[PDB]
């Protein structure tokens, strides 16, 4: 259940962030040049508005998903360590019992 | 100038800012994920060890347990780990974005090429910038201060314990770490 | 595919649980822009010149004329030093052209016929900025004796190899040699080229009067601006007192007020010229042309209020009073609440700037006034000059007070930066509301008056101000408006729109300059036509609109108001050593001086402040990386932090373990025994309480981009100490 | 001059000797004897709360209006009485805490195996268990000397309409919250580093609020986190309001009373420092600590 996260969720989201970085870097230049060489400037304008809105929404969505995945991963690891602490405490108690028995 | 041109330029600028933000967010998330992955590796190793130790402990035999009175001290004592972190600001530790902004800064003059011609056999650039200078100066100050302070100041188990004390006496204890230098200074000061 | 979806994405992203975290005006605008570009280029050259390190101190020297390898060290030195000499050539050309341009502007502006028209205050301030740039560049070139030696070595090497053949090349080289050889070259050229202009001192009197006015009325925000005003005052007085002009005659005519400037200089006596190179302000008076025969006029030349410990009562009172009110403010709102947030943002910025100014002023005064071996009993005789300017120049109380003030600055900075969104919205809303109210409602009465009158210059200007900054909520100005026609209002309510958006820089500047034009003493005056209340309200709005530009950029100005980067840099004092030193020891570094003082004295009250004194390094390193823009400076800061942080961890862990061991031992001691011992005058004293809890809880200390878990390191050291204690007991 | 020394009976060594003599039975008896007095004091506090219910109910809802809130506070009655009673409760709980620590140190040393089993059991109880089982678990643990978030002795003692009682508990929290800045005017509220607390014991209010809130809102099935969060909001607002004052008599001890918020958040197992930062800036507390430690 933790492997599903570690191996493919977080790395996949990071690759998605890199892809968004590249795409947005290209879309900025495309929008600028399109406005410069556009017959109607108004139409180019609301199109640029649409691209900026889409970019903001997509980036926010991606960041939100990565944050959620990291949060869940950390919580799972904390649970594992709590369980393993309990088991280690039990082993320590058993060893102490054995040593006291030997002494007696 | 028409205003719509300025507004469109600004829109392109904010999209560029969005792309930069995406890269920076990716950097942060990768920095988190790497160390989380390291924790996962350590947890798996410790779990394997705990499973082994539990199956081993469940089959300890007290009645068969035998303790060697003669070997009480010739046995090697258990020592806990003593790892202590230092040099936390080496260049290796530099984050990635800070390195990116560091690499666009102006480099010192190529003053090393003069090195093969220098009679002293010292580096050419060490006369222009010596980051190790602070450490060297501090060490030198510490060494002379310590020396000045020093100058101013001036049955069979019986066999086993005997062997243990002999080993302890002979096997006594045996630098460029600041902590060691301070410890020596204060110890001499006492 | 809409604002709603993106905004919803952001909102849902901002709610995750994160615990464990604790006309005649366009030409003026154009010339102003060009002058600003020249200013920034001059700053680039100034930084190039401040961070110049001798490259000829590493070139091996030649002893015999038959050194086996003489040619091929000359080839090495020419190739090493060619680009540095290119830099110096560009510097010389820049300063020459800059003086040409400034003098051309001064000449154009002072023309007899043109001396009647007004000049916006912004242009005067920019002129002051050039005079200050020339001052700083000249003083920098004066200090740096390494550039002379580097150029001389390059010239010898280049002539030995016959690398230069052209006549123009030799002439340029020899011109550069003249430039570098001389002393006070730039100021001398400025003087010799100014005085040819007839009546040039009137414009400088205008500059100095404007600066005195602004300083008196406190029309500045950043400490940089506050000190720029004084520097401009001083250098303008120096320039005005040449051969063809006399400032004492000019003062006898009540054209300038020497007494006010003298009082200002007396109160504040030193300001940072650049980096750690200070400038004493009375030095401009001392060296003026006619100072000696008039030396009795000034009382700022003798020599008190720099004991930082005196201001601490007031600083604490103001800190608590302001933060208590700010903490209260942590749906759509009325205009009163947004106006209150605007007032509160401005007030916080002003307080931060004031505190930063206190700290830096004390630092500068201390630098210029090194101590002696009689003043301070502990100062060694063989004490370096820098070591005597910083290390031994402060008492214990002074160091503690400086740490307190720096910590207050940084804490209030984080608090203010936390509210950046609310402040941005409030500020933009208030600015838009004020601008639109003024433009649409307040300018109706004067415009009606001017329409009912033959005079049309006022009408053209007022109308122009309306086209510039009016946002007609229906898209067009009301048509049945009687004020526009001239007839009296019957009334005629107009609904002023609201929205959070500030005016572009260009149009805000245009509006402010046009308002300044209406209320102008000299312009046959436009202020004569205006009535009483009209000019009173115009003067009001013009005064409050001063800080709009600063406040719209709240984040940048917050950064500027809390800048303490200069406490580390030491290039000036390094140059004065004449090569004897390549850098100073950490025990001479100011941040470590403060941090180590706290650590050594084991001060309980100040134990919570240590990490801010450490944080000083972050500001210094960021400055070195982003403004100075040099790699070796960051390498040096990183090395210093590497050493000092290890020392800090060691000392802190040691004293923490000692403190808790002593407390444990004291808790278990027999109480009746303590009573008995006290009754016989042999008291076993208690251990003083101390505040280590906050340090033990630190887990993400920030230094130079690294996150340091202090708790882990303290645990390692303390566990080693506990093992040692148990071993010693057994 | 009292005819005895209080430190020769309450010292760590003395409390450990008392635990040795008395054992879990005697220590349980001592704790019950103390919770009797706490219950008495809480009864008096409830009387005081009910005789102010209208103004208290209004104040609980109008904390956003400084002028209206000041007007409401003017009409309250018996405020220093409330503070005195809560201080007494805190003192008694502090004595109980000393005794419990002594007992734990003795027991972990005489019977290590039982103590280890008890601690293992207490630590790892599922957090999804209900109150009935957790009360038995906590009762065993407390008998062993371990510290518990919800004191079972107090829960049992404070039980001797139900919705009226819940309302009364909430308004008791409100009352105590808004009455704090009255402590600045007092001259004995000085914080002494040689004491690590105030002369007139107002540093035990941390114990008083945390323990009383836990007990009452377990008895009346509330939410301890939410109630303590509301209390913190109100107390921080009141002290921030006194922050701007200038009188030299009603703000003689602003810093000492400011330190109480830090003490409360430190003691509480339900309040973290993030909440305190959100409602009360920590720079004020840093400066207060510097001032007192001068």
TrEMBL record, chain A:
Domain T-SNARE coiled-coil homology: 43-104
Subcellular location, record wording: Cell projection, Filopodium; Cell projection, Lamellipodium; Cytoplasm, Cytoskeleton
Family classification: Belongs to the ABI family.
Record-given protein name: Abl interactor 2
Organism listed in the record: Homo sapiens
Lineage, opening ranks: Eukaryota, Metazoa, Chordata, Craniata, Vertebrata
Coverage span on the entire protein: 3 to 106 of 458
